[PDB]
Amino acid sequence: MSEESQAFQRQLTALIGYDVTDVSNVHDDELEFTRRGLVTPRMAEVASRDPKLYAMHPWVTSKPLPEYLWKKIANNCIFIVIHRSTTSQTIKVSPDDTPGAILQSFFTKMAEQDFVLRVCGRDEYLVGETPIKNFQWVRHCLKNGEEIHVVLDTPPDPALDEVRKEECDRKFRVKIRGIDIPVLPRNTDLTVFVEANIQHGQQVLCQRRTSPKPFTEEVLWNVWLEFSIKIKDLPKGALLNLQIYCLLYYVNLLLIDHRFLLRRGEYVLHMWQISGFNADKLTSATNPDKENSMSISILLDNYCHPIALPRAEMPNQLRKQLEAIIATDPLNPLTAEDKELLWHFRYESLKHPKAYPKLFSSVKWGQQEIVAKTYQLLARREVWDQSALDVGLTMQLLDCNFSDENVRAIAVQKLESLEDDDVLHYLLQLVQAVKFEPYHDSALARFLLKRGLRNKRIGHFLFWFLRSEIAQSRHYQQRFAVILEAYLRGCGTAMLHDFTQQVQVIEMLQKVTLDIKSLSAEKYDVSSQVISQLKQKLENLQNSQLPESFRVPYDPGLKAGALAIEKCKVMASKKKPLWLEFKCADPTALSNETIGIIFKHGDDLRQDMLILQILRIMESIWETESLDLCLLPYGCISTGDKIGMIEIVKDATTIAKIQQSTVGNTGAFKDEVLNHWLKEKSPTEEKFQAAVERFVYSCAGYCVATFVLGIGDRHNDNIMITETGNLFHIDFGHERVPFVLTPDFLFVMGTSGKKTSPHFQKFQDICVKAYLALRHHTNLLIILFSMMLMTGMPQLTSKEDIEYIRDALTVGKNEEDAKKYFLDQIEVCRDKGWTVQFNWFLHLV
Numbered sequence: 001m002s003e004e005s006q007a008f009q010r011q012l013t014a015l016i017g018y019d020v021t022d023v024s025n026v027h028d029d030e031l032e033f034t035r036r037g038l039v040t041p042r043m044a045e046v047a048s049r050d051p052k053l054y055a056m057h058p059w060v061t062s063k064p065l066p067e068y069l070w071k072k073i074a075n076n077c078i079f080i081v082i083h084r085s086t087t088s089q090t091i092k093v094s095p096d097d098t099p100g101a102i103l104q105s106f107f108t109k110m111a112e113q114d115f116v117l118r119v120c121g122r123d124e125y126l127v128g129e130t131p132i133k134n135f136q137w138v139r140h141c142l143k144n145g146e147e148i149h150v151v152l153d154t155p156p157d158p159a160l161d162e163v164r165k166e167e168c169d170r171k172f173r174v175k176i177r178g179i180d181i182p183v184l185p186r187n188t189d190l191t192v193f194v195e196a197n198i199q200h201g202q203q204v205l206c207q208r209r210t211s212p213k214p215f216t217e218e219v220l221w222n223v224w225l226e227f228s229i230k231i232k233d234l235p236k237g238a239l240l241n242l243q244i245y246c247l248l249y250y251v252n253l254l255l256i257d258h259r260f261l262l263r264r265g266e267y268v269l270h271m272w273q274i275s276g277f278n279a280d281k282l283t284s285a286t287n288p289d290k291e292n293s294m295s296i297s298i299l300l301d302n303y304c305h306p307i308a309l310p311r312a313e314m315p316n317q318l319r320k321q322l323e324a325i326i327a328t329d330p331l332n333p334l335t336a337e338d339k340e341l342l343w344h345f346r347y348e349s350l351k352h353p354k355a356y357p358k359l360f361s362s363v364k365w366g367q368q369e370i371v372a373k374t375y376q377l378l379a380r381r382e383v384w385d386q387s388a389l390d391v392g393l394t395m396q397l398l399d400c401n402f403s404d405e406n407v408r409a410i411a412v413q414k415l416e417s418l419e420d421d422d423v424l425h426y427l428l429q430l431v432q433a434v435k436f437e438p439y440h441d442s443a444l445a446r447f448l449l450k451r452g453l454r455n456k457r458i459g460h461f462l463f464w465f466l467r468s469e470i471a472q473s474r475h476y477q478q479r480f481a482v483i484l485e486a487y488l489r490g491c492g493t494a495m496l497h498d499f500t501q502q503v504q505v506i507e508m509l510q511k512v513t514l515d516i517k518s519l520s521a522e523k524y525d526v527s528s529q530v531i532s533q534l535k536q537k538l539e540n541l542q543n544s545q546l547p548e549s550f551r552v553p554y555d556p557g558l559k560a561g562a563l564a565i566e567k568c569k570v571m572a573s574k575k576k577p578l579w580l581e582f583k584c585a586d587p588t589a590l591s592n593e594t595i596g597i598i599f600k601h602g603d604d605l606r607q608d609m610l611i612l613q614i615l616r617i618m619e620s621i622w623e624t625e626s627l628d629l630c631l632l633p634y635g636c637i638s639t640g641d642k643i644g645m646i647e648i649v650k651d652a653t654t655i656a657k658i659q660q661s662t663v664g665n666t667g668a669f670k671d672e673v674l675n676h677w678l679k680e681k682s683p684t685e686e687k688f689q690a691a692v693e694r695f696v697y698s699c700a701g702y703c704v705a706t707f708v709l710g711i712g713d714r715h716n717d718n719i720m721i722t723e724t725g726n727l728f729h730i731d732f733g734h735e736r737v738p739f740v741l742t743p744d745f746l747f748v749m750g751t752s753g754k755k756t757s758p759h760f761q762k763f764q765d766i767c768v769k770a771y772l773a774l775r776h777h778t779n780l781l782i783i784l785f786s787m788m789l790m791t792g793m794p795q796l797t798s799k800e801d802i803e804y805i806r807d808a809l810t811v812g813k814n815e816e817d818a819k820k821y822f823l824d825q826i827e828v829c830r831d832k833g834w835t836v837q838f839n840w841f842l843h844l845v
């Protein structure tokens with residue numbers, strides 16, 4: 001390759017945080033084949049993208065303006081303040097005007113044609129043919145009662161986006177030779193055997209074991225394990241799952257490779273251990289640590305290529321049984337009797353898209369004759385292709401329960417029709433979904449590829465999402481690094497530049513973030529000594545190695561300029577994270593405000609990303625129902641290991657320490673303090689009324705959203721409010737109360753203990769409207785939740801843990817019983833009062 005082609009690839013590694021040209025931990029060519037395989041899709045999308053539109057990345061939507069946002073326009077007239085930067089002239093606009101119509105009517109109303117609008121202070125353009133009402137930045141202003149300011153400047157040069165050119169009927173069997181391990185320290189010497197499973201989609205097809213023996217650094221068996229399943233009956237994407245019990249270690253080997261060739265030869269596999277189910281147990285990856293990790297030596301010998309090739313109406317009562325089956329929630333288990341009905345009737349089942357996950361779970365994947373039929377069945381997809389895209393339904397086909405490439409591919413087919421507004425909504429969960437893919441190159445992996453390359457805002461978050469995992473998952477980091485590399489070769493030198501800047505800042509500051517944790521420990525107090533250094537270090541960073549500006553990873557519209565070293569401070573949290581503030585690099589930025597970002601170590605910010613994302617989902621669901629719950633899913637991006645950044649919400653304080661308004665160094669509580677905090681924080685009386693109004697919506701929001709996610713019981717310390725009346729939860733790492741509805745909250749709604757008011761009626765009433773809107777999405781919520789547990793939490797009950805949300809969403813009831821159920825929850829919160837809050841700190845010491 002060229003000498004530069006290598007200076008290039010090292011650049012790629014520093015951005016990735018992993019070296020994908022490194023072949024030390026692979027027993028095959030799957031990953032390199034996948035690098036090569038992705039070259040076409042990469043090149044295809046770069047080739048098909050309009051350079052101009054790709055350069056300006058307009059953020060748009062096809063959805064109708066919600067009703068709550070139409071009213072906020074009581075004229076059919078929108079006002080745009082256009083600033084050429086000396087005199088700015090406002091304009092009265094129709095909701096249907098394209099950018100071009102206003103750029104046209106802006107030169108008319110001034111009593112060469114290639115000038116564009118910009119959102120003052122952000123890298124957001126209003127451009128392309130879309131009605132201004134369909135632009136996100138605009139809907140964002142209307143929701144917040146905010147003026148639309150646009151400075152007029154020149155379109156960005158697409159040259160900057162330039163991309164560098166490129167360059168048998170036998171029963172299956174496996175011999176288990178034995179297991180070598182460098183050291184075994186534990187306490188009680190025990191017996192150790194090996195459990196071999198044939199797996200397809202978390203379904204175990206066949207299982208065998210070895211004779212247990214004394215546990216030693218090396219154990220030899222030299223045993224052939226003969227399975228029942230015949231070689232031809234092995235489905236593509238079938239795993240050999242090898243586990244050691246006494247369950248200590250596990251490792252996986254794909255039985256059919258990326259060429260559809262059956263696996264043969266000798267294998268020494270380095271395994272994963274366990275801490276005293278979960279998506280990591282699925283990985284075709286081997287433990288990179290060859291020094292400290294159990295290994296297994298096995299043998300495969302068998303024959304070549306197994307490949308893939310190309311009237312009765314139900315009595316009513318059976319059709320009624322079938323229909324009862326399809327209706328059940330995603331978590332509801334299928335009997336043998338259930339599956340046989342679903343199967344025998346496959347042709348009927350095909351007319352019901354909501355039945356596909358159950359129907360495909362009714363397949364014997366261990367039988368080539370049956371799989372073949374399944375494909376014949378898939379061949380006539382008419383009903384599936386024409387159906388309305390159901391995201392929750394599509395998402396079910398991408399989980400750990402489906403290992404078939406054709407099954408998963410149809411789900412991806414249906415995603416193809418998602419426009420960027422919605423891909424952004426689901427990007428994080430789809431990327432996590434990559435983990436359930438049997439092979440590194442996948443239809444889904446390629447769709448994330450195209451979508452990121454086609455759009456910079458998608459590309460931006462794709463990048464960070466992938467880098468999050470690559471840094472923190474030895475399990476999935478190899479496959480992700482290949483996908484990230486694929487992306488980076490297509491995104492343009494412009495973004496390639498941004499990422500590097502972003503990356504430099506993040507390392508530099510993650511460095512500081514840890515060094516400050518190490519010196520100081522939990523008083524929890526902040527040494528004047530610690531503080532002076534925190535300034536010492538940061539100041540050197542500002543001068544010595546500064547990337548003069550950078551994109552804010554959770555808000556890529558915004559470029560942070562230089563730090564304000566004076567407003568920076570260590571946090572008194574328990575982990576001692578940094579509280580940082582930057583100047584905005586955009587001088588045309590309208591406000592004088594800095595950009596606060598909190599850098600922290602010791603939380604898994606990955607669970608927090610996932611949680612914040614589901615919140616952004618509940619919002620979009622309500623938007624479709626014309627609801628606004630005034631949530632505040634602040635930006636949070638995971639980066640390291642127990643490390644990442646978080647967006648500072650301006651003017652927010654903790655509800656706790658609003659309690660501390662009068663005293664604060666013990667506990668207890670007092671009603672009306674909060675409403676007192678509000679009058680005090682409102683400039684006018686009209687703004688105080690608005691604050692009480694906002695707090696009612698935002699409180700109703702976190703009440704419903706939190707209850708469903710089963711995170712509803714939180715310390716006052718984790719709840720925050722703005723000086724503007726907006727309430728929001730934080731720190732989502734991980735008797736009871738359904739949620740937090742306290743007398744201090746209630747007091748602000750105008751009631752103190754049992755009684756009722758005009759605002760308090762407004763609250764209950766919203767929750768119920770909000771609550772029932774979610775229930776319409778239960779399956780969507782259930783799948784998202786379950787996937788979040790598998791990919792995002794530690795080892796879970798992929799039975800019990802998932803269920804909370806089933807009971808929570810009142811699956812199976814009618815909207816009537818439900819409305820009551822939730823209202824009772826409010827009563828339950830009125831009955832605890834301060835009892836729940838009061839208990840934290842009891843065990844503190």
Ligand SMILES: Cc1c(CN2CCN(C(=O)[C@H](C)O)CC2)sc2c(N3CCOCC3)nc(-c3cnc(N)nc3)nc12
Nearest residue numbers: 571572573603608634646647648649652730731732733
């Ligand atoms: C402990 C804490 C705050 C209260 N602190 C009060 C004291 N303080 C000080 O600086 C004073 C001077 O001592 C800092 C803030 S504010 C805040 C916060 N905010 C900042 C504002 O915008 C919204 C988010 N996030 C997280 C947090 C931590 N971890 C995770 N995973 N998620 C969220 N913790 C906190």
